[PDB]
Amino acid sequence: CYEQLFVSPEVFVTLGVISLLENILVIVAIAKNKNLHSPMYFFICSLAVADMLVSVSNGSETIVITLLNTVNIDNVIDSVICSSLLASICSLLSIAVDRYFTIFYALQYHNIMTVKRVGIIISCIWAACTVSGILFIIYSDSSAVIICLITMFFTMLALMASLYVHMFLMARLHIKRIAVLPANMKGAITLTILIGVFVVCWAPFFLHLIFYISCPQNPYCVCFMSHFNLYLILIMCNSIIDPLIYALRSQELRKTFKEI
């Protein structure tokens, strides 16, 4: 069981090229459109970048290990992945917080959430994620770095879940108020997909990290940690799914997707 299950090198590149082509299509589909130039799609643009960037950055790894079959070389690639990975999780939160503001302010939002502020926020998140990622990979051998990643991810997941749940409660409040003038499954399904895909794809990697810190010696844990490549595949599987559950959901974007 402590054999360290490894997946064939040919499949990493497969997921790599599909996620790469899906995300460059999505960013184009909104870059060309001026109607799809609202603060909402600027955060979806940031996600499409992060998702694509972690696929090639990971696809790159599979190509380099196959060719290599060095130390300074890896710190380069890993610092990209780790930085590009945080940017993805922060981008998903940033979409969730934007969606929350559009509903629970709705009037104030339009003036407080400016194109300038969207521009500096996206850039400030990407700049913080890149610096934190490089800082994490340089001090990878450290115990604190892994504890930070786990704590940060759990916080991101908690907030993200809380926001979408609170929205669904405000959506249920409306549907209940539309009982006087004449059902809940529409909101429950989309809420279950959004919070379900994120957890299923990501958490497993961070369950590996918390075991890495807690139980490296435990017979039960080592069998879970043995499947590290399968966890990386799931993190890559999120990059191909993001376009389907975020971008393609809007009618205007889906129309431009079918056109291109």
Binding site: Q4, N58, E61, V64, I73, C82, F228, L232
Partner: peptide, 13 residues
């Protein structure tokens, strides 16, 4: 390291 592999923190040591 000596023999690099996918991601980081994959091997327990």
């Amino acid at each position: 390291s000596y023999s690099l592999e996918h991601x980081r923190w994959g091997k327990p040591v």
